[PDB]
Every structure is written in C-alpha cells, then in structure tokens.
C-alpha cells in the first residue's frame, strides 16, 4: 500500500506542476518577505500592464492552454467550439487565465495588444535576450525567430526544470 501511495504522490505532484495554483499544503511558511522579484510565479495571471479598454473573451478549454497562444478547435459539431494551445497560421489569441471549476479559458484576441509573462520554448532560453523577436510554435510556446509581432522585454525565468517564462509584448499581426 505504501508503494501505491508513493506512485499516487508522484503522479499528483506531476499534475500539480502542470497547473497554475494547485491546492498544495505544507507545514512551513514560504519565505516571501521582500518586495522585489516576487512576480516571477506561475500563478501571476493577467498582464503586467493592463488597460481598462481591453477586450476579453472566455472559451471552453481543451487541455491546459494557460499562458500559451490559443487556436480555435472544432469538434464533430455536437458541442460548441473550444480553444487549444497552438500557433502559426492558426493563432487566434493569448490565454491569460483559467477558471478550473468551470474549465473556462480567458483569451485576449490577437487584435488587442498584450504585455505579460508567457511560456517560452525550452530550446533557446539562454539565447533569448531583451529586444529579440519571438513567434508562437505549434504548442503555443514562444520561440526566437513571421506573421506575429512579439518582442521579449526581458530574459527567461526558470520556474521549473521544463517550465520557463518570458516577459513579452504581443503587438498583433505582422506582414
């Protein structure tokens, strides 16, 4: 039974790591008692600089598209359309938040300018520097360079061994 508990713990830990704000408890208090460099967390939803005139939509979520570029995905037609992580010619917007109880993804359309922390592809994270041009891959991850204007305003931040975030400004569509 102990081995099964261990396997259960490992799998629930993986699923928690693949989440924004898991219900994880501990006996100690996290050492967050300074006012600098406290926004480099995966639960930092929304944008760093948000305007009061931004258009916001909500969609059914297919998978976990949090902090990733989204594309419209259609089913057999029995159910309504939803959004899934993607990019390229299929890019439709940027997912900024997820309500997990209802499975709803908050999307800012590509026609609206955005600025915030987004997932970065784990290939050239060291090579990403401020001012570099970025594009969305097939998995909704930003990568160093087409049809999308995206500029990194900072360097990569390693939240987890396979999780890197980058502060980026997504303008809109490029020629």
């Amino acid at each position: 039974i102990t081995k099964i508990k261990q396997e259960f713990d490992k799998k629930v830990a993986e699923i928690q790591a693949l989440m924004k704000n898991p219900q994880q408890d501990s006996g100690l208090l996290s050492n967050s008692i300074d006012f600098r460099d406290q926004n480099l967390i995966f639960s930092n939803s929304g944008g760093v600089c948000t305007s009061s005139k931004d258009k916001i939509e909500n969609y059914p979520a297919k998978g976990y598209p949090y902090k990733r570029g989204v594309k419209l995905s259609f089913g057999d037609g029995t159910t309504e359309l939803e959004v899934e992580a993607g990019g390229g010619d299929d890019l439709y917007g940027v997912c900024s938040d997820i309500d997990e109880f209802s499975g709803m993804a908050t999307v800012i359309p590509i026609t609206n300018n955005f600025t915030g922390y987004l997932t970065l592809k784990k290939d050239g994270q060291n090579g990403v520097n401020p001012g570099d041009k970025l594009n969305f891959n097939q998995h909704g991850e930003l990568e160093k360079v087409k049809s999308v204007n995206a500029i990194a305003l900072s360097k990569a931040h390693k939240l987890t061994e396979d999780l890197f975030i980058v502060l980026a400004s997504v303008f809109g569509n490029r020629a």
């Binding site: 501990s26 100690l28 208090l29 967050s32 930092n44 948000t50 009061s52």
Partner: peptide, 12 residues
C-alpha cells in the same frame, strides 16, 4: 494602461 499589483496565497 496602468501597472498592476498581483496577489498570491499559501496554505499551511
């Protein structure tokens, strides 16, 4: 466009 202040929680 105004800068934002976030929030976070920790359960013990």
């Amino acid at each position: 466009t105004i800068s934002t202040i976030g929030f976070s929680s920790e359960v013990v």
